[PDB]
Amino acid sequence: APITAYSQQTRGLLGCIITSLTGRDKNQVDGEVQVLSTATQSFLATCVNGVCWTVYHGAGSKTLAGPKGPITQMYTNVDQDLVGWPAPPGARSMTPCTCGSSDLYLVTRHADVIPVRRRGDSRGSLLSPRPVSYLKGSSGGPLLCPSGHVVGIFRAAVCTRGVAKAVDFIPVESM
Amino acid sequence: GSVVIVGRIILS
Ligand SMILES: *[C@@](=O)([C]([C][C](F)F)[N]C(=O)[C]([C][C]([C])[C])[N]C(=O)[C]([N]C(=O)O[C]C1=[C][C]=[C][C]=[C]1)[C]([C])[C][C])C([O])=O
Hints:
heterodimer; A: mainly beta; Thrombin, subunit H; 2 domains; five-stranded antiparallel beta sheet; 2 helices; globular; B: mainly beta; rod-shaped; binds ligand 0F7; Non-structural protein 4A (chain B)
């Protein structure tokens, strides 16, 4: 893989519970991809052009904790399964890929970069199958072209018997 | 109940 990545955790349970309730986050933000958490689910947000983008089925209609109190979505689209919040300052905003590549790389919550073959506007197959459980918590993660620009945001795993053979994603066009 | 950033992935 020609894009590399690594994570850094910023909080644990107590902080997370507490920051959810109050909605106030004073942590320094950094990175292209935020790891997120509410009570009942884990997922990712991808910062593109100034906005942090993730799945509706994860964030629902909720605010995001931020430095001055909770941040309201500026984009909420139930059918495309997409929501957006103004990125807090610190987030490294990526750029929408337009080149048209067909070799894509999915960035997971554990900071693997894995190869995807684009098959349609919003589908790609895994060149190597993975367990669905290894993809859990990566919804919202970016699909990337080789130049590192974003084509889409990860949404669903298409699987049989616990193994993920393909992915459904929300094309950057939508964003 | 707000969504909370619990960590981050730095890309390269
Ligand atoms: C993500 O939220 C999770 C990532 C990982 F598990 F795949 N995504 C999902 O849970 C989605 C949720 C759904 C409401 C879109 N579900 C799946 O990924 C499931 N597969 C399936 O139902 O998708 C087929 C499909 C996708 C897109 C369009 C049409 C059909 C699996 C849960 C079934 C084994 C997270 O947890 O990070």
